[PDB]
């Protein structure tokens, strides 16, 4: 839990990084967003 | 000590006197807890059911 190892740490930061919405600068030339309580990672 | 008689080679060894702790089974067993402790260090042979 509090305790973790490097692969879990990296993946959680990856999932956090991924979650952020689509950028609007691309859009002017869809989304899958996760909400933590409703959808668990299932790792 | 079963009463059995047997003929064995002369060179076979043995240890003089009787085994220690004689009379062990002749104290009355008081209770189920005593039986639990005896079997606790033996094996899953008790209770039989």
């Amino acid at each position: 839990g509090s305790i973790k190892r490097f692969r879990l740490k990296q993946r959680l930061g990856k999932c956090r990084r991924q979650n952020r919405p689509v950028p609007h600068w691309y859009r002017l030339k869809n989304t899958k967003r996760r909400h933590w309580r409703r959808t668990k990672l299932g790792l | 000590p079963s009463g059995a008689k047997k003929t064995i080679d002369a060179k076979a060894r043995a240890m003089v006197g009787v085994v220690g702790a004689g009379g062990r089974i002749d104290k009355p067993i008081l209770k189920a807890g005593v039986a639990h402790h005896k079997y606790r260090v033996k094996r899953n042979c008790w209770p039989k059911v």
Binding site: - | V16, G17, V18, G20, A21, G22, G23, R24, D26, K27, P28, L30, K31
Partner: protein, 85 residues
């Protein structure tokens, strides 16, 4: 002591458990917890410390013995038989 009329030390088990068995237990338990005489050192400090094992407190020596008292007759008879020849 004078607390019990005749039950004595098996008064710890009390009214629970059949009486004849309590009498049988009384004889074994009395033998078990007695302080026996040590052959080596001449004091009455020999007690049972584990099932077949009797240690004297004073001289700190472990004699292997019977279950409920130090000696059976069997070993004595054998011992005398070996000695005589």
């Amino acid at each position: 002591s004078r607390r019990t009329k005749k039950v004595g030390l098996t008064g710890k088990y009390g009214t629970r458990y059949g009486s004849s068995l309590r009498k049988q237990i009384k004889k074994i338990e009395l033998m078990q917890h007695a302080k026996y005489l040590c052959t080596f050192c001449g004091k009455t400090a020999t007690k049972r410390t584990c099932v077949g094992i009797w240690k004297c407190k004073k001289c700190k020596r472990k004699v292997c013995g019977g279950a409920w008292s130090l000696t059976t007759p069997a070993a004595v008879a054998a011992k005398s038989t070996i000695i005589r020849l």
